[PDB]
Short mmCIF file of all heavy atoms in Angstrom, two decimals:
data_model
loop_
_atom_site.label_atom_id
_atom_site.label_comp_id
_atom_site.label_asym_id
_atom_site.label_seq_id
_atom_site.Cartn_x
_atom_site.Cartn_y
_atom_site.Cartn_z
N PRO G 13 -5.43 4.24 8.94
CA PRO G 13 -5.01 4.36 10.34
C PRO G 13 -6.13 4.91 11.22
O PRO G 13 -6.31 4.43 12.35
CB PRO G 13 -3.85 5.35 10.26
CG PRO G 13 -3.33 5.22 8.87
CD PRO G 13 -4.53 4.99 8.04
N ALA G 14 -6.89 5.88 10.71
CA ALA G 14 -8.08 6.42 11.38
C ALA G 14 -9.21 5.39 11.58
O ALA G 14 -10.21 5.68 12.24
CB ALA G 14 -8.61 7.66 10.66
N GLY G 15 -9.05 4.19 11.00
CA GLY G 15 -9.94 3.06 11.26
C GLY G 15 -11.09 2.83 10.29
O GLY G 15 -12.00 2.04 10.58
N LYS G 16 -11.05 3.49 9.13
CA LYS G 16 -12.15 3.44 8.18
C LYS G 16 -11.81 2.69 6.89
O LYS G 16 -10.69 2.79 6.39
CB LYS G 16 -12.63 4.86 7.85
CG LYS G 16 -13.47 5.52 8.94
CD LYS G 16 -13.83 6.96 8.60
CE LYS G 16 -15.06 7.06 7.68
NZ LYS G 16 -16.35 7.00 8.44
N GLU G 17 -12.78 1.95 6.37
CA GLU G 17 -12.63 1.29 5.08
C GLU G 17 -12.71 2.33 3.97
O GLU G 17 -13.66 3.10 3.90
CB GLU G 17 -13.69 0.20 4.86
CG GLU G 17 -13.64 -0.98 5.85
CD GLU G 17 -12.41 -1.87 5.71
OE1 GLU G 17 -11.70 -1.81 4.67
OE2 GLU G 17 -12.15 -2.65 6.65
N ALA G 18 -11.68 2.35 3.12
CA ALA G 18 -11.61 3.31 2.02
C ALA G 18 -11.09 2.64 0.75
O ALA G 18 -10.43 1.60 0.81
CB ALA G 18 -10.74 4.50 2.41
N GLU G 19 -11.39 3.25 -0.39
CA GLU G 19 -10.89 2.83 -1.69
C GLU G 19 -9.97 3.93 -2.22
O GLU G 19 -10.43 5.00 -2.60
CB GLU G 19 -12.05 2.58 -2.65
CG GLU G 19 -12.68 1.20 -2.54
CD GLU G 19 -12.51 0.38 -3.80
OE1 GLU G 19 -13.18 0.70 -4.81
OE2 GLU G 19 -11.71 -0.58 -3.80
N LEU G 20 -8.67 3.65 -2.21
CA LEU G 20 -7.66 4.68 -2.49
C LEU G 20 -6.66 4.22 -3.54
O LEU G 20 -6.24 3.06 -3.56
CB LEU G 20 -6.91 5.06 -1.21
CG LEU G 20 -7.68 5.53 0.03
CD1 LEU G 20 -6.75 5.58 1.23
CD2 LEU G 20 -8.35 6.89 -0.20
N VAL G 21 -6.29 5.14 -4.42
CA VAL G 21 -5.23 4.87 -5.38
C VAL G 21 -3.89 5.22 -4.74
O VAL G 21 -3.67 6.37 -4.33
CB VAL G 21 -5.47 5.56 -6.77
CG1 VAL G 21 -6.08 6.94 -6.62
CG2 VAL G 21 -4.19 5.61 -7.60
N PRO G 22 -3.00 4.22 -4.62
CA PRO G 22 -1.70 4.42 -3.98
C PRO G 22 -0.82 5.36 -4.79
O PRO G 22 -0.93 5.41 -6.01
CB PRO G 22 -1.10 3.02 -3.94
CG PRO G 22 -1.80 2.28 -5.06
CD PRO G 22 -3.17 2.84 -5.11
N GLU G 23 0.03 6.12 -4.10
CA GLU G 23 0.91 7.06 -4.76
C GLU G 23 2.19 6.40 -5.29
O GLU G 23 2.75 6.85 -6.28
CB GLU G 23 1.24 8.22 -3.82
CG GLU G 23 -0.01 8.87 -3.23
CD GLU G 23 0.26 10.23 -2.62
OE1 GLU G 23 1.44 10.62 -2.50
OE2 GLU G 23 -0.73 10.91 -2.27
N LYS G 24 2.63 5.34 -4.61
CA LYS G 24 3.79 4.55 -5.03
C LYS G 24 3.50 3.10 -4.70
O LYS G 24 2.88 2.80 -3.68
CB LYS G 24 5.07 4.98 -4.29
CG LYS G 24 5.43 6.47 -4.36
CD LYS G 24 6.11 6.85 -5.67
CE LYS G 24 6.41 8.34 -5.74
NZ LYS G 24 7.52 8.75 -4.81
N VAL G 25 3.96 2.20 -5.56
CA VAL G 25 3.84 0.77 -5.32
C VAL G 25 5.16 0.07 -5.63
O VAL G 25 5.89 0.47 -6.54
CB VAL G 25 2.67 0.12 -6.12
CG1 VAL G 25 1.34 0.84 -5.80
CG2 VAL G 25 2.95 0.10 -7.64
N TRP G 26 5.46 -0.97 -4.86
CA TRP G 26 6.68 -1.76 -5.05
C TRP G 26 6.55 -3.14 -4.41
O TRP G 26 5.67 -3.38 -3.57
CB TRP G 26 7.92 -1.02 -4.52
CG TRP G 26 7.95 -0.82 -3.02
CD1 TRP G 26 8.63 -1.58 -2.11
CD2 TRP G 26 7.29 0.22 -2.26
NE1 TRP G 26 8.43 -1.10 -0.84
CE2 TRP G 26 7.62 0.01 -0.90
CE3 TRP G 26 6.46 1.30 -2.60
CZ2 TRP G 26 7.15 0.84 0.13
CZ3 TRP G 26 5.99 2.11 -1.59
CH2 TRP G 26 6.34 1.88 -0.23
N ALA G 27 7.42 -4.06 -4.83
CA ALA G 27 7.46 -5.39 -4.26
C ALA G 27 8.40 -5.36 -3.07
O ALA G 27 9.46 -4.73 -3.13
CB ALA G 27 7.92 -6.42 -5.30
N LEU G 28 7.98 -6.00 -1.99
CA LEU G 28 8.82 -6.13 -0.80
C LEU G 28 9.06 -7.62 -0.56
O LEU G 28 8.22 -8.30 0.03
CB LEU G 28 8.16 -5.43 0.40
CG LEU G 28 8.85 -5.48 1.77
CD1 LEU G 28 10.23 -4.84 1.71
CD2 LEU G 28 8.00 -4.82 2.86
N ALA G 29 10.19 -8.13 -1.04
CA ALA G 29 10.49 -9.57 -0.97
C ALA G 29 11.98 -9.85 -0.80
O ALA G 29 12.82 -9.25 -1.48
CB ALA G 29 9.97 -10.27 -2.20
N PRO G 30 12.30 -10.78 0.14
CA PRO G 30 13.67 -11.23 0.31
C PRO G 30 14.04 -12.23 -0.79
O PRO G 30 13.17 -12.69 -1.53
CB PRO G 30 13.63 -11.93 1.67
CG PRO G 30 12.26 -12.42 1.82
CD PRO G 30 11.38 -11.43 1.08
N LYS G 31 15.32 -12.54 -0.89
CA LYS G 31 15.80 -13.54 -1.83
C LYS G 31 15.24 -14.92 -1.46
O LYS G 31 15.34 -15.36 -0.32
CB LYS G 31 17.33 -13.57 -1.86
CG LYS G 31 17.94 -12.31 -2.45
CD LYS G 31 19.40 -12.19 -2.07
CE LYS G 31 19.88 -10.76 -2.27
NZ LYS G 31 21.33 -10.61 -1.93
N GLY G 32 14.63 -15.57 -2.44
CA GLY G 32 14.12 -16.92 -2.26
C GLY G 32 12.70 -17.06 -1.75
O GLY G 32 12.21 -18.17 -1.60
N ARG G 33 12.04 -15.93 -1.45
CA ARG G 33 10.67 -15.94 -0.90
C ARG G 33 9.80 -14.93 -1.65
O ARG G 33 10.31 -13.92 -2.14
CB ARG G 33 10.67 -15.65 0.61
CG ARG G 33 11.64 -16.50 1.45
CD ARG G 33 11.74 -16.03 2.92
NE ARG G 33 12.85 -16.67 3.63
CZ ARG G 33 13.00 -16.72 4.96
NH1 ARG G 33 12.10 -16.18 5.77
NH2 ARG G 33 14.06 -17.34 5.50
N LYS G 34 8.50 -15.21 -1.73
CA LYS G 34 7.55 -14.40 -2.52
C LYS G 34 7.44 -12.94 -2.07
O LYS G 34 7.34 -12.03 -2.91
CB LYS G 34 6.16 -15.05 -2.50
CG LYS G 34 5.22 -14.53 -3.59
CD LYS G 34 3.79 -15.00 -3.39
CE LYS G 34 2.89 -14.49 -4.51
NZ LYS G 34 1.69 -15.37 -4.70
N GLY G 35 7.46 -12.73 -0.76
CA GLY G 35 7.26 -11.41 -0.18
C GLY G 35 5.86 -10.90 -0.42
O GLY G 35 4.93 -11.69 -0.63
N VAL G 36 5.71 -9.58 -0.40
CA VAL G 36 4.42 -8.91 -0.59
C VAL G 36 4.60 -7.69 -1.46
O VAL G 36 5.72 -7.27 -1.71
CB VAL G 36 3.80 -8.46 0.76
CG1 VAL G 36 3.25 -9.65 1.53
CG2 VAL G 36 4.82 -7.70 1.59
N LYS G 37 3.48 -7.13 -1.92
CA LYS G 37 3.48 -5.85 -2.61
C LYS G 37 2.99 -4.77 -1.66
O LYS G 37 2.02 -4.98 -0.91
CB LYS G 37 2.60 -5.90 -3.86
CG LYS G 37 3.22 -6.71 -4.98
CD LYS G 37 2.20 -7.05 -6.05
CE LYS G 37 2.87 -7.80 -7.19
NZ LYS G 37 1.97 -7.89 -8.35
N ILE G 38 3.66 -3.63 -1.69
CA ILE G 38 3.37 -2.54 -0.76
C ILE G 38 2.94 -1.28 -1.51
O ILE G 38 3.53 -0.92 -2.55
CB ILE G 38 4.56 -2.23 0.21
CG1 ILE G 38 4.89 -3.46 1.08
CG2 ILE G 38 4.27 -1.01 1.09
CD1 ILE G 38 3.76 -3.90 2.05
N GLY G 39 1.90 -0.63 -0.99
CA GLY G 39 1.46 0.66 -1.48
C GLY G 39 1.67 1.74 -0.43
O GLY G 39 1.50 1.49 0.76
N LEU G 40 2.08 2.92 -0.88
CA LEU G 40 2.09 4.11 -0.04
C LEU G 40 0.82 4.93 -0.30
O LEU G 40 0.59 5.37 -1.42
CB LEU G 40 3.35 4.96 -0.30
CG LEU G 40 3.46 6.31 0.44
CD1 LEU G 40 3.58 6.15 1.96
CD2 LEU G 40 4.59 7.15 -0.11
N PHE G 41 0.02 5.13 0.75
CA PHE G 41 -1.28 5.77 0.63
C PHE G 41 -1.37 7.06 1.44
O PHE G 41 -0.63 7.26 2.39
CB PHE G 41 -2.38 4.83 1.12
CG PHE G 41 -2.55 3.58 0.30
CD1 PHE G 41 -1.76 2.45 0.56
CD2 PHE G 41 -3.49 3.53 -0.72
CE1 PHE G 41 -1.92 1.29 -0.20
CE2 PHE G 41 -3.66 2.38 -1.48
CZ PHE G 41 -2.87 1.25 -1.22
N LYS G 42 -2.31 7.92 1.05
CA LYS G 42 -2.60 9.12 1.81
C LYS G 42 -4.04 9.07 2.31
O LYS G 42 -4.97 8.95 1.52
CB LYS G 42 -2.38 10.36 0.94
CG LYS G 42 -2.22 11.64 1.72
CD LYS G 42 -1.86 12.77 0.80
CE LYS G 42 -1.22 13.91 1.57
NZ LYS G 42 -0.81 15.00 0.65
N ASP G 43 -4.21 9.14 3.63
CA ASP G 43 -5.53 9.16 4.26
C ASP G 43 -6.20 10.50 3.91
O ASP G 43 -5.71 11.55 4.30
CB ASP G 43 -5.39 8.98 5.77
CG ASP G 43 -6.70 8.62 6.47
OD1 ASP G 43 -7.80 8.94 5.95
OD2 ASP G 43 -6.62 8.03 7.57
N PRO G 44 -7.32 10.46 3.16
CA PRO G 44 -7.92 11.70 2.65
C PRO G 44 -8.44 12.59 3.77
O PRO G 44 -8.44 13.82 3.65
CB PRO G 44 -9.08 11.20 1.79
CG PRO G 44 -9.43 9.85 2.38
CD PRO G 44 -8.10 9.27 2.77
N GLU G 45 -8.88 11.95 4.86
CA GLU G 45 -9.40 12.65 6.02
C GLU G 45 -8.29 13.36 6.79
O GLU G 45 -8.28 14.60 6.85
CB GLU G 45 -10.20 11.69 6.91
CG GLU G 45 -11.59 11.32 6.32
CD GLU G 45 -12.49 10.58 7.31
OE1 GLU G 45 -12.09 10.43 8.50
OE2 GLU G 45 -13.60 10.15 6.91
N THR G 46 -7.34 12.60 7.35
CA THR G 46 -6.25 13.16 8.17
C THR G 46 -5.11 13.82 7.39
O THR G 46 -4.37 14.63 7.94
CB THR G 46 -5.63 12.11 9.13
OG1 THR G 46 -5.00 11.07 8.36
CG2 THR G 46 -6.69 11.49 10.04
N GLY G 47 -4.95 13.46 6.12
CA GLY G 47 -3.85 13.97 5.31
C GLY G 47 -2.52 13.27 5.55
O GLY G 47 -1.48 13.68 5.02
N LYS G 48 -2.54 12.21 6.35
CA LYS G 48 -1.32 11.47 6.68
C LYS G 48 -1.08 10.28 5.75
O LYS G 48 -2.01 9.73 5.15
CB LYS G 48 -1.34 11.01 8.15
CG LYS G 48 -1.17 12.16 9.15
CD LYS G 48 -0.93 11.65 10.58
CE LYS G 48 0.56 11.56 10.94
NZ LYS G 48 1.32 10.52 10.17
N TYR G 49 0.19 9.89 5.65
CA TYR G 49 0.61 8.80 4.79
C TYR G 49 0.68 7.50 5.57
O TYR G 49 0.93 7.50 6.77
CB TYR G 49 1.98 9.09 4.17
CG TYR G 49 1.97 10.18 3.12
CD1 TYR G 49 2.07 11.53 3.48
CD2 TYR G 49 1.89 9.86 1.77
CE1 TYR G 49 2.07 12.53 2.51
CE2 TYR G 49 1.90 10.85 0.80
CZ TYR G 49 1.99 12.18 1.17
OH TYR G 49 1.99 13.16 0.20
N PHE G 50 0.46 6.39 4.87
CA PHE G 50 0.58 5.08 5.48
C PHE G 50 0.81 4.02 4.41
O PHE G 50 0.46 4.19 3.23
CB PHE G 50 -0.66 4.76 6.32
CG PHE G 50 -1.93 4.66 5.53
CD1 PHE G 50 -2.45 3.41 5.19
CD2 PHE G 50 -2.61 5.81 5.12
CE1 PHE G 50 -3.63 3.31 4.45
CE2 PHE G 50 -3.79 5.72 4.39
CZ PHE G 50 -4.30 4.47 4.06
N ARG G 51 1.43 2.92 4.83
CA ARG G 51 1.70 1.83 3.92
C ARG G 51 0.70 0.72 4.15
O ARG G 51 0.25 0.51 5.27
CB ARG G 51 3.12 1.33 4.11
CG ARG G 51 4.12 2.28 3.50
CD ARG G 51 5.50 2.04 4.02
NE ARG G 51 6.47 2.88 3.33
CZ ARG G 51 6.67 4.17 3.58
NH1 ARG G 51 5.97 4.81 4.52
NH2 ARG G 51 7.58 4.83 2.88
N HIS G 52 0.38 -0.01 3.10
CA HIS G 52 -0.60 -1.08 3.20
C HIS G 52 -0.26 -2.16 2.19
O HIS G 52 0.23 -1.87 1.10
CB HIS G 52 -1.99 -0.49 2.95
CG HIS G 52 -3.12 -1.41 3.31
ND1 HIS G 52 -3.87 -1.25 4.45
CD2 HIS G 52 -3.63 -2.49 2.67
CE1 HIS G 52 -4.80 -2.19 4.50
NE2 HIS G 52 -4.67 -2.96 3.44
N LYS G 53 -0.52 -3.42 2.56
CA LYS G 53 -0.42 -4.54 1.63
C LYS G 53 -1.33 -4.33 0.40
O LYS G 53 -2.46 -3.87 0.53
CB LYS G 53 -0.80 -5.84 2.33
CG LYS G 53 -0.39 -7.07 1.55
CD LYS G 53 -1.24 -8.28 1.90
CE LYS G 53 -1.07 -9.35 0.83
NZ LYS G 53 -1.19 -10.71 1.40
N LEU G 54 -0.81 -4.70 -0.77
CA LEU G 54 -1.60 -4.68 -2.00
C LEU G 54 -2.01 -6.10 -2.35
O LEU G 54 -1.37 -7.06 -1.91
CB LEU G 54 -0.78 -4.07 -3.13
CG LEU G 54 -0.30 -2.64 -2.96
CD1 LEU G 54 0.57 -2.24 -4.14
CD2 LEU G 54 -1.48 -1.68 -2.79
N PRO G 55 -3.09 -6.27 -3.14
CA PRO G 55 -3.39 -7.62 -3.61
C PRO G 55 -2.22 -8.17 -4.45
O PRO G 55 -1.50 -7.40 -5.10
CB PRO G 55 -4.63 -7.43 -4.50
CG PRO G 55 -5.21 -6.12 -4.09
CD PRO G 55 -4.06 -5.27 -3.65
N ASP G 56 -2.04 -9.49 -4.41
CA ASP G 56 -0.94 -10.17 -5.10
C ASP G 56 -0.83 -9.89 -6.60
O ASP G 56 0.26 -9.92 -7.15
CB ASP G 56 -0.99 -11.69 -4.87
CG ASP G 56 -0.69 -12.07 -3.43
OD1 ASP G 56 0.02 -11.31 -2.73
OD2 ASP G 56 -1.16 -13.14 -2.99
N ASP G 57 -1.96 -9.59 -7.25
CA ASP G 57 -1.98 -9.36 -8.69
C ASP G 57 -1.97 -7.88 -9.07
O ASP G 57 -2.13 -7.54 -10.25
CB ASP G 57 -3.16 -10.11 -9.35
CG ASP G 57 -4.54 -9.58 -8.93
OD1 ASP G 57 -4.64 -8.68 -8.05
OD2 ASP G 57 -5.55 -10.09 -9.48
N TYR G 58 -1.76 -7.02 -8.09
CA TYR G 58 -1.65 -5.59 -8.35
C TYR G 58 -0.35 -5.28 -9.11
O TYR G 58 0.73 -5.69 -8.69
CB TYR G 58 -1.72 -4.78 -7.05
CG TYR G 58 -2.06 -3.33 -7.28
CD1 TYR G 58 -3.38 -2.88 -7.19
CD2 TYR G 58 -1.08 -2.41 -7.60
CE1 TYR G 58 -3.70 -1.55 -7.41
CE2 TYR G 58 -1.39 -1.07 -7.83
CZ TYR G 58 -2.70 -0.66 -7.73
OH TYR G 58 -3.02 0.66 -7.95
N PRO G 59 -0.45 -4.54 -10.24
CA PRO G 59 0.70 -4.31 -11.11
C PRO G 59 1.71 -3.31 -10.56
O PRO G 59 1.33 -2.21 -10.15
CB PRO G 59 0.07 -3.75 -12.40
CG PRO G 59 -1.42 -3.84 -12.21
CD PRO G 59 -1.66 -3.87 -10.74
N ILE G 60 2.99 -3.69 -10.57
CA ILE G 60 4.06 -2.80 -10.11
C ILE G 60 4.57 -1.88 -11.22
O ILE G 60 4.89 -2.23 -12.34
CB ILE G 60 5.24 -3.58 -9.44
CG1 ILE G 60 4.75 -4.38 -8.22
CG2 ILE G 60 6.39 -2.62 -9.08
CD1 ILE G 60 3.82 -3.62 -7.24
#
């Protein structure tokens, strides 16, 4: 959110998909600088 490219290990991961459609995978992340949480798309092959 602070606008910087970072490499972060998500604290929680899950699939976000409706019935009949692929959806996406979501990670809950913590910005190391600000200390705030944010959600971000994960790569399709990221393990849930």
Side-chain angles (χ1 to χ4, degrees):
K16 284 176 83 83
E17 297 292 344
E19 276 244 288
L20 305 169
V21 38
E23 308 196 351
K24 306 280 178 71
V25 305
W26 67 98
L28 178 60
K31 292 162 198 181
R33 310 172 191 197
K34 197 191 181 155
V36 286
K37 287 165 177 192
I38 299 297
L40 175 66
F41 295 86
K42 199 174 200 178
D43 195 336
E45 286 191 5
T46 65
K48 289 191 95 293
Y49 289 85
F50 64 101
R51 285 163 175 79
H52 192 104
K53 195 205 164 148
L54 300 176
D56 292 334
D57 66 356
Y58 199 95
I60 301 314

